[PDB]
Design a protein around this ligand. Structure first.
Ligand code: ZN
Lengths: 220, 60
């Protein structure tokens, strides 16, 4: 309840027509910074859609160069799209982005449109990529174990056998959902790019063609 | 130099049947099946053998 009220207040304060007193503009800027900082970890929580909507509305303004936070919000959105592999948060952001663009007749800054270039869901890598060197003790040593009762050991076995099948099912569900999210995001991105091309905005052509070249081979 | 074997139905080297060799009052070497040794009772919190409690089989 309190987080809902806080996010609603942040959204209300973010909307400032840049014509009121400078105190209100400062309030809106601080609210936008707070929302930008909050979404870095509260993305997997309730009412993330409101934060996404307010941040994208701030970004999708016709003039954002005077805004002292557009750089940071674009960086955060790019990081969110880059680190998201399953495609759930990416699709959630892209739906709102398309909804906002359709209202503005697809008129944004090339830089804004550049966030779609960082979509991890539309990227494919080597099946055997080398991750970072991560080292940990494989198993607790036998002579350094903690005593467990027979009932405790039986419960440990049961919960391990449950967890193994839960992990298998989780992997299967993630694999089957990534493909569908990828298809939906491809549809949305290609629709946005084609609408931009039909509008023929002289300041957005290069980014659009780069997006087509990057994501062209991921489609059907 | 006298060779002995199992005295029961099980012919295999299982933990259940184990053989010792003893010289009987008749002057011969004979086999004898040995029972499983008992286990000391253990503490229910740390698992160490309890002190002052006899080590017997479950039914003893
Ligand atoms: Zn103890």
């Amino acid at each position: 309840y309190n987080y809902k009220n806080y996010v609603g207040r942040l959204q209300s304060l973010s909307k400032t027509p840049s014509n009121a007193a400078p105190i209100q503009v400062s309030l809106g800027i601080l609210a936008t910074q707070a929302a930008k900082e909050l979404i870095s970890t509260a993305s997997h929580f309730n009412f993330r859609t409101d934060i996404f909507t307010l941040l994208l509305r701030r970004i999708c303004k016709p003039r954002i160069s005077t805004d002292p936070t557009s750089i940071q919000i674009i960086q955060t959105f790019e990081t969110l799209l880059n680190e998201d592999e399953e495609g759930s948060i990416s699709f959630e952001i892209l739906r709102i982005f398309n909804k906002i663009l359709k209202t503005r007749n697809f008129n944004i800054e090339e830089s804004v449109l550049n966030m779609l270039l960082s979509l991890d869901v539309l990227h494919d890598y080597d099946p055997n990529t080398k991750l970072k060197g991560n080292v940990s003790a494989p198993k607790l040593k036998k002579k350094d174990r903690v005593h467990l009762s027979k009932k405790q050991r039986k419960a440990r076995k049961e919960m391990q056998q449950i967890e193994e099948e839960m992990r298998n099912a989780e992997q299967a569900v993630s694999a089957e959902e990534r493909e569908r999210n990828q298809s939906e995001i491809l549809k949305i991105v290609f629709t946005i790019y084609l609408n931009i091309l039909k509008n023929n905005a002289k300041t957005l052509i290069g980014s659009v063609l780069e997006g087509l070249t990057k994501f062209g081979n991921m489609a059907n | 130099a006298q060779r002995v074997t199992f005295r029961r139905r099980n012919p295999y080297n299982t933990r259940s049947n184990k053989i010792k060799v003893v010289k009987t009052p008749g002057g011969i070497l004979r086999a004898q099946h040995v029972k499983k040794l008992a286990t000391r009772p253990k503490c229910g919190d740390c698992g160490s053998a309890l002190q002052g409690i006899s080590t017997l089989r479950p039914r003893q």
